[PDB]
Design a protein around this nucleic acid. Sequence first.
DNA 1: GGGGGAAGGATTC
DNA 2: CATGAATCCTTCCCCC
Length: 341
Amino acid sequence: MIVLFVDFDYFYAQVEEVLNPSLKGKPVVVCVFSGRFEDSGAVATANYEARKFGVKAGIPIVEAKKILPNAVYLPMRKEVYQQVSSRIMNLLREYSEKIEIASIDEAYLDISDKVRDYREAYNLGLEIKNKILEKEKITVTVGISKNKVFAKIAADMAKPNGIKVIDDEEVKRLIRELDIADVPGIGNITAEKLKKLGINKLVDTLSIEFDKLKGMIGEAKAKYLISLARDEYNEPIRTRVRKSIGRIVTMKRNSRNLEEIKPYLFRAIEESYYKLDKRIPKAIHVVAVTEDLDIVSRGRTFPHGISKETAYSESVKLLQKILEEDERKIRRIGVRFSKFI
DNA sequence: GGGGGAAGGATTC
DNA sequence: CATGAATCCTTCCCCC
Ligand SMILES: Nc1ncnc2c1ncn2[C@H]1C[C@H](O)[C@@H](COP(=O)(O)OP(=O)(O)OP(=O)(O)O)O1
Ligand SMILES: [Ca+2]
Ligand SMILES: [Ca+2]
Ligand SMILES: [Ca+2]
């Protein structure tokens, strides 16, 4: 089995560079403006010119301007990036019918029956980078290995605008030298739990009784890491379909007033329904972000589909339930629809 | 005991 | 200061 992972470089900002080439070379910061005070919000992503100085995804726009006050700041345009992404995704289909689209800018290709070895896979890589660079003017990093995880790790090491292969020989090496934290699916919270257990590299997970592992990070995460350490991880490439659709907005100011909140909530439902387009949900959840960045939610599944009318009234109750069951103020309110018919 | 779904949350990218 | 969706976990609950 041979996997080829494609990851587009600094995607949102690169698409803005493509649409306005006079930007290539200058630090570009794509942000989400919360409408609260001035320049309130966060950075969705930034090109590398900007990342050299610490401006990256997740930091306040405010801290970014303090560092790069003259950089170009642009408001995120998700719809545009999505259509550009869809076109690139369609180009990849012509290289394998077995393709897994993991996110707006990541995709795994199962190229076992289109190639015989790593030389041809690597070659197919350059061919794909070029096809995309020509047709869309988007540079992408490619990763190639025996399974999805290592394909992705490969790209993580080769980005930006790179390509790298991790042969079986190097796979066994990494399982021993690679920092467990660099393994996809291992975030700051799990990496921490892993250190207290003394597990610092993939291999280390073998010198520990599975039961203590399952207890600390869960069974799923345990079997996952153990199979990667044993080098028997071989999850297939599957076409994934939406199981959920929703939206959450930020308020001008925190609140607990049902009447002051409703507008934002209804706005979220209107936009969610628009995205459902033909899909009908049997379940709805109202999600709130408390004044201290905590997340609470109340839901309800119905035996039948939900009409926009029902959604509107039901969401109000679930919101009231949240207020009744939590004294804190709400910072962000929103809805989520799932269990489509 | 244990299947199976539902609800609220934890984590990750 | 702090802007969509998947997968997994724990606890309930109904029930044969
Ligand atoms: N914190 C975030 N907030 C909003 N969107 C995000 C965030 N992190 C990532 N994204 C989105 C927008 C990015 O362009 C896209 C690509 O995934 P990402 O992990 O960030 O790849 P990257 O390291 O190559 O840079 P880039 O973010 O520009 O693509 O995912
Ligand atoms: Ca990515
Ligand atoms: Ca990317
Ligand atoms: Ca990590």
